[PDB]
Amino acid sequence: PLGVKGRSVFAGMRSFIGQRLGRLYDSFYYSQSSTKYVMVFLFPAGIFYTRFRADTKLGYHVFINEEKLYPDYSQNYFDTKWTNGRKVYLDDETTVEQLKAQIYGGKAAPENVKVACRGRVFEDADNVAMAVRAFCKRDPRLLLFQDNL
Amino acid sequence: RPGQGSNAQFQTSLADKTRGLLGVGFLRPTKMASFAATFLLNFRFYFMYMARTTFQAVRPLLAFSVFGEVMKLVLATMSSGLFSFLFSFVLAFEVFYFFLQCYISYTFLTMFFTVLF
Amino acid sequence: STSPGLAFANLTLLLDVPQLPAIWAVNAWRELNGLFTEMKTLAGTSDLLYPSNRYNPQNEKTNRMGRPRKYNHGEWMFGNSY
Amino acid sequence: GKIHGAVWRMKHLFATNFKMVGHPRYAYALPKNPLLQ
Amino acid sequence: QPGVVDPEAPQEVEAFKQAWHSRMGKFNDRSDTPMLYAYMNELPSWEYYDLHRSAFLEHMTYFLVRTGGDFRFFPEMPPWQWLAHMENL
Amino acid sequence: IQHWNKSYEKQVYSESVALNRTFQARNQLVLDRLKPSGAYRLPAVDYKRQLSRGTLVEGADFYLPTAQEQQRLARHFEPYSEQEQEERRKFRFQSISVYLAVALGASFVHDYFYQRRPVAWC
Amino acid sequence: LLGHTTSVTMGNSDIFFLPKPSNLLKIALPAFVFMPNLTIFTRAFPFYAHTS
Numbered sequence: 001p002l003g004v005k006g007r008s009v010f011a012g013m014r015s016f017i018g019q020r021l022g023r024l025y026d027s028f029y030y031s032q033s034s035t036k037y038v039m040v041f042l043f044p045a046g047i048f049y050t051r052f053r054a055d056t057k058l059g060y061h062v063f064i065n066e067e068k069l070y071p072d073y074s075q076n077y078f079d080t081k082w083t084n085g086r087k088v089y090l091d092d093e094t095t096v097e098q099l100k101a102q103i104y105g106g107k108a109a110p111e112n113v114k115v116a117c118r119g120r121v122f123e124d125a126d127n128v129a130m131a132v133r134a135f136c137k138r139d140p141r142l143l144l145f146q147d148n149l
Numbered sequence: 150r151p152g153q154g155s156n157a158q159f160q161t162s163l164a165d166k167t168r169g170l171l172g173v174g175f176l177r178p179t180k181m182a183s184f185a186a187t188f189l190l191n192f193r194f195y196f197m198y199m200a201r202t203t204f205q206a207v208r209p210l211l212a213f214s215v216f217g218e219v220m221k222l223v224l225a226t227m228s229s230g231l232f233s234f235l236f237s238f239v240l241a242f243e244v245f246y247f248f249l250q251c252y253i254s255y256t257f258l259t260m261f262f263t264v265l266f
Numbered sequence: 267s268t269s270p271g272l273a274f275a276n277l278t279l280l281l282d283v284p285q286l287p288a289i290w291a292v293n294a295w296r297e298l299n300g301l302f303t304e305m306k307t308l309a310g311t312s313d314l315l316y317p318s319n320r321y322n323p324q325n326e327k328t329n330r331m332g333r334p335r336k337y338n339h340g341e342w343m344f345g346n347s348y
Numbered sequence: 349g350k351i352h353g354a355v356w357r358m359k360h361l362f363a364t365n366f367k368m369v370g371h372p373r374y375a376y377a378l379p380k381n382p383l384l385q
Numbered sequence: 386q387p388g389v390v391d392p393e394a395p396q397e398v399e400a401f402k403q404a405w406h407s408r409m410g411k412f413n414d415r416s417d418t419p420m421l422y423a424y425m426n427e428l429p430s431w432e433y434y435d436l437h438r439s440a441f442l443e444h445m446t447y448f449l450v451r452t453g454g455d456f457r458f459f460p461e462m463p464p465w466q467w468l469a470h471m472e473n474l
Numbered sequence: 475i476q477h478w479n480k481s482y483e484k485q486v487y488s489e490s491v492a493l494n495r496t497f498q499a500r501n502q503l504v505l506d507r508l509k510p511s512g513a514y515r516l517p518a519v520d521y522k523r524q525l526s527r528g529t530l531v532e533g534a535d536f537y538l539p540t541a542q543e544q545q546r547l548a549r550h551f552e553p554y555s556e557q558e559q560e561e562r563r564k565f566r567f568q569s570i571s572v573y574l575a576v577a578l579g580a581s582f583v584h585d586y587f588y589q590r591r592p593v594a595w596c
Numbered sequence: 597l598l599g600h601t602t603s604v605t606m607g608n609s610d611i612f613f614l615p616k617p618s619n620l621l622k623i624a625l626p627a628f629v630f631m632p633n634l635t636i637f638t639r640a641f642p643f644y645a646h647t648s
């Protein structure tokens with residue numbers, strides 16, 4: 001005897017969802033605290049953040065020409081030295097000045113520092129995304145150098 | 150009451166109830182970190198297994214292709230009749246060796262693709 | 267259950283099925299961004315908007331590539347220069 | 349092929365027995381013999 | 386099912402039962418080649434009492450006295466009230 | 475030695491009392507409130523407890539849904555009705571004709587609708 | 597015809613037909629397992645997948 005008169009398939013769906021959620025809560029309650037919190041919140045959250053950032057934002061590999069231009073990361077922890085080839089995720093509204101400040105930690109940067117991609121110098125009042133689109137399409141490798149000349 | 154004698158001993162302090170709410174000796178973030186580390190380290194077994202599986206799967210392909218290339222070099226270089234008479238037996242041995250490798254691969258693959266449930 | 271020969275599938279599952287929620291979220295976010303862009307276009311814009319393009323910086327004082335517009339200091343009889 | 353072999357053996361081992369009218373696990377359902385007593 | 390003439394034979398039935406038990410054991414049991422026994426910090430009742438025979442005795446005597454009853458009704462997991470009273474005693 | 479070890483035991487038991495107090499508090503505060511009702515409990519019993527109860531069954535990796543299908547080997551006289559026999563007589567062999575037709579249709583679709591690739595033109 | 601040369605498409609040509617004579621065979625044959633059974637022991641799969 002499938003179905004009952006007066007009851008709706010939507011009510012059945014609601015009841016089934018309630019059953020599933022109650023069973024999930026029971027199974028989460030009767031579980032190890034060492035594993036469940038991690039496997040249910042911390043790995044999903046990190047995976048979600050990483051995937052969303054990768055599939056939504058757009059990143060650039062940053063290099064610096066000379067060692068004397070490297071920033072001072074001695075104080076901040078978990079990164080005590082600059083490494084070239086660093087992946088940096090940015091927003092579509094970011095400019096070259098904002099990128100430079102983010103690199104040098106909002107501190108006094110060297111003089112006549114400029115950004116290039118594939119040998120082509122960017123203006124400081126230029127959008128990084130559009131400048132890359134124009135000069136180095138699908139090759140976002142940026143280089144910070146000193147323009148004395 | 151039946152259980153009042155026991156429930157009278159259950160009188161906690163403010164600090165005790167705060168510590169219980171926080172879960173000091175029952176959450177064990179060090180245990181959680183140990184579990185995470187062990188779980189991430191346990192990913193090496195997948196790589197080991199896939200390596201073994203691929204090796205056992207390509208073993209016959211190797212026996213059939215690279216030793217075949219060697220035999221083909223020998224055929225391309227040899228002209229006389231005595232050496233050819235002697236090399237025919239090497240070819241037959243390669244046949245038998247290919248069948249042996251196929252048997253070994255069949256055995257290891259039925260071992261690696263056998264599931265209880 | 268499983269076996270050594272299923273290491274490929276086990277790894278693929280463990281590393282991919284947790285990403286499906288994020289993939290669906292990305293798809294939903296893209297849909298919402300498209301909806302907002304189309305609503306803005308319907309409302310009206312000085313310069314056009316490219317729908318399927320990453321970024322649209324064009325305005326009355328900015329080109330479609332993020333640079334200032336040339337010859338935009340004065341006014342023109344035919345209105346906008348674009 | 350497995351099914352074929354199974355049926356090919358069932359033929360030889362059942363079709364000429366006179367004792368396997370069905371499977372022994374279901375002999376309770378057979379009528380009762382009027383010759384036994 | 387196997388391609389044998391009589392799969393409903395007692396030999397087949399007993400073989401299936403033994404395979405069933407061996408599989409379930411190899412999967413669930415605590416052994417030197419464990420499948421499921423892994424990442425254990427909070428043990429279930431059975432394994433806990435099998436590893437700690439001292440607690441089984443105490444938790445059992447308390448159950449028979451606190452509630453005059455048979456071992457056949459021994460609870461799966463004891464209450465925290467009982468545990469605390471045991472610790473005080 | 476003696477005194478230090480006995481004091482070690484005494485402080486061990488002090489720590490035990492502290493742990494017990496916080497355990498009681500944790501339970502009666504959080505867990506007695508978050509405890510599930512039991513309506514959505516697990517609808518099964520462990521195989522060990524079933525074996526002790528004398529209730530475990532191991533067999534029938536398959537099943538037979540309908541009683542018409544369950545009682546075939548017991549009927550002994552009409553395992554299949556007449557209509558069912560007439561229907562079964564239509565599948566004495568596999569249909570290579572249907573195989574061929576379906577395979578040709580699927581190949582046509584898969585090749586000329588789903589697997590089209592560009593080709594140069596000079 | 598700059599952006600119209602990659603649009604000239606030709607379909608594939610494979611035919612998926614092979615007679616299956618089973619009357620010739622009387623033995624079973626081995627078969628692969630392609631995916632792990634997630635319908636059983638679903639909750640423990642991440643914990644026992646690395647074993648054998």
Ligand SMILES: CCCCCCCCCCCCCCCCCC(=O)OC[C@H](COP(=O)([O-])OCC(O)COP(=O)([O-])OC[C@@H](COC(=O)CCCCCCCCCCCCCCCCC)OC(=O)CCCCCCCCCCCCCCCCC)OC(=O)CCCCCCCCCCCCCCCCC
Binds near residue numbers: 012020287291
């Ligand atoms: C943002 C933070 C995110 C973090 C998470 C936050 C929380 C979110 C919710 C959790 C989401 C994760 C879900 C994990 C559940 C599975 C893994 C697990 O650990 O479960 C253990 C957990 C505890 O299990 P246990 O303690 O080991 O034993 C108790 C049994 O489970 C007790 O079993 P039972 O007796 O109560 O009932 C039997 C049970 C059986 O469950 C099981 O035991 C195993 C289930 C199998 C899982 C894998 C199956 C994969 C099958 C392959 C699919 C191939 C399809 C091919 C189709 C071809 C046709 C063209 O039935 C089911 O629930 C399964 C139904 C779905 C199976 C569908 C398979 C196809 C059949 C279609 C049937 C018809 C549709 C249903 C109609 C119902 C009426 C409306 O399992 C459960 O609680 C119930 C099973 C899970 C059911 C699904 C619950 C809803 C999940 C929603 C997912 C949506 C996520 C997306 C969110 C949006 C993001 C943008």
Ligand SMILES: CCCCCCCCCCCCCCCCCC(=O)OC[C@H](COP(=O)([O-])OCC(O)COP(=O)([O-])OC[C@@H](COC(=O)CCCCCCCCCCCCCCCCC)OC(=O)CCCCCCCCCCCCCCCCC)OC(=O)CCCCCCCCCCCCCCCCC
Binds near residue numbers: 570573580581584616
């Ligand atoms: C536009 C809308 C959307 C598209 C839908 C298009 C239209 C379809 C609508 C849906 C179906 C029709 C609905 C109305 C039916 C109304 C009539 C009716 O009620 O009865 C049916 C109607 C009459 O039924 P009947 O009254 O009971 O009498 C039937 C006859 O007595 C005959 O009975 P029989 O026992 O003698 O069976 C004959 C059988 C004979 O038995 C066999 O099948 C043996 C051969 C099997 C080959 C291996 C099978 C592999 C299956 C893979 C399937 C996926 C492939 C991917 C798909 C694209 C392939 C390119 O031959 C077949 O018919 C099956 C052909 C399977 C396709 C062939 C694929 C190529 C195989 C390649 C093998 C060679 C590999 C090496 C290649 C290298 C060559 C140099 O006949 C049929 O239409 C049969 C249906 C065929 C379906 C396929 C067979 C089932 C196989 C399942 C495979 C897994 C599929 C999973 C499904 C999706 C997941 C849930």
Ligand SMILES: CCCCCCCCCCCCCCCCCC(=O)OC[C@H](COP(=O)([O-])OCC(O)COP(=O)([O-])OC[C@@H](COC(=O)CCCCCCCCCCCCCCCCC)OC(=O)CCCCCCCCCCCCCCCCC)OC(=O)CCCCCCCCCCCCCCCCC
Binds near residue numbers: 587
């Ligand atoms: C021994 C055996 C004897 C055999 C005898 C044979 C001689 C008998 C005569 C028949 C000969 C066979 C003809 C085969 C087709 C023509 C050859 C071919 O395939 O060329 C490739 C060529 C491929 O097109 P393409 O642009 O180069 O690239 C294709 C890519 O997929 C493009 O890539 P894309 O990314 O742009 O994707 C676009 C795609 C997008 O597609 C989709 O997104 C989804 C597709 C729809 C899925 C369903 C969704 C539901 C909505 C549709 C609802 C349809 C059901 C109705 C529902 C009503 C309720 C609302 O759009 C389509 O592909 C549309 C496909 C159109 C299908 C609908 C046409 C009716 C189908 C039924 C015809 C039945 C003929 C039976 C013949 C008898 C055989 C025994 O085909 C076409 O150009 C389109 C075909 C247009 C129909 C022409 C029909 C006339 C020719 C046949 C004459 C007989 C007419 C009989 C009519 C009967 C009433 C229906």
Ligand SMILES: CCCCCCCCCCCCCCCCCC(=O)OC[C@H](COP(=O)([O-])OCC[N+](C)(C)C)OC(=O)CCCCCCCCCCCCCCCCC
Binds near residue numbers: 008009010016
């Ligand atoms: C869309 C692509 C699907 C392709 C793959 C899936 C297979 C294709 C076949 C359809 C899949 C769904 C089959 C459902 C079968 C269950 C029928 C049934 O009666 O179940 C018992 C329920 C509960 O019934 P009941 O308990 O209320 O009353 C009847 C009680 N008995 C059974 C005792 C008589 O019945 C229903 O109400 C219908 C449920 C099915 C309808 C929903 C489909 C489920 C799939 C979606 C999952 C997500 C749910 C949330 C959706 C929210 C929508 C906004």
Ligand SMILES: CCCCCCCCCCCCCCCCCC(=O)OC[C@H](COP(=O)([O-])OCC[N+](C)(C)C)OC(=O)CCCCCCCCCCCCCCCCC
Binds near residue numbers: 425
């Ligand atoms: C084409 C694709 C086909 C493939 C199929 C794709 C779909 C199906 C894929 C499923 C396979 C993967 C399933 C793995 C599931 C593992 C996750 C898991 O079980 O968690 C680990 C924990 C581990 O528990 P455990 O550590 O005690 O024991 C695990 C196993 N042993 C004993 C061996 C260690 O599992 C649980 O106990 C809970 C699981 C159910 C809950 C699932 C998460 C949702 C929770 C929501 C409730 C939140 C309540 C919050 C309340 C807070 C206050 C109390």
Ligand SMILES: CCCCCCCCCCCCCCCCCC(=O)OC[C@H](COP(=O)([O-])OCC[N+](C)(C)C)OC(=O)CCCCCCCCCCCCCCCCC
Binds near residue numbers: 248251252255
């Ligand atoms: C759990 C699953 C386990 C799976 C285990 C898998 C391991 C074994 C896999 C080996 C597969 C090798 C087969 C492909 C190589 C042959 C290609 C071919 O047919 O050439 C065209 C052959 C030879 O053609 P030809 O040489 O006369 O001329 C044309 C050749 N071409 C087209 C290439 C130019 O076609 C035939 O006419 C052959 C007919 C005779 C039968 C030959 C088959 C037997 C020899 C191979 C046995 C290998 C399996 C041994 C298994 C042992 C297990 C105990």
Ligand SMILES: CCCCCCCCCCCCO[C@@H]1O[C@H](CO)[C@@H](O[C@H]2O[C@H](CO)[C@@H](O)[C@H](O)[C@H]2O)[C@H](O)[C@H]1O
Binds near residue numbers: 057290292295
């Ligand atoms: C319960 C339903 C859940 C369904 C899933 C819904 C999506 C949930 C996540 C939405 C995240 C919203 O948060 C927002 O994300 C987008 C994309 O990263 C960011 O936006 C970023 O990408 C877009 C596209 O260029 C621009 O806004 C800008 O380039 C940049 O800032 C915002 O800075 C951030 O504030």
Ligand SMILES: CCCCCCCCCCCCO[C@@H]1O[C@H](CO)[C@@H](O[C@H]2O[C@H](CO)[C@@H](O)[C@H](O)[C@H]2O)[C@H](O)[C@H]1O
Binds near residue numbers: 587591603605
């Ligand atoms: C006799 C009638 C039988 C009814 C059959 C009806 C089936 C209709 C289903 C057609 C679905 C085809 O789906 C479509 O396949 C073609 C490949 O050919 C793909 O085609 C794609 O690749 C080709 C080749 O690079 C390019 O033209 C282009 O990049 C793109 O169109 C489409 O991305 C896909 O959307």
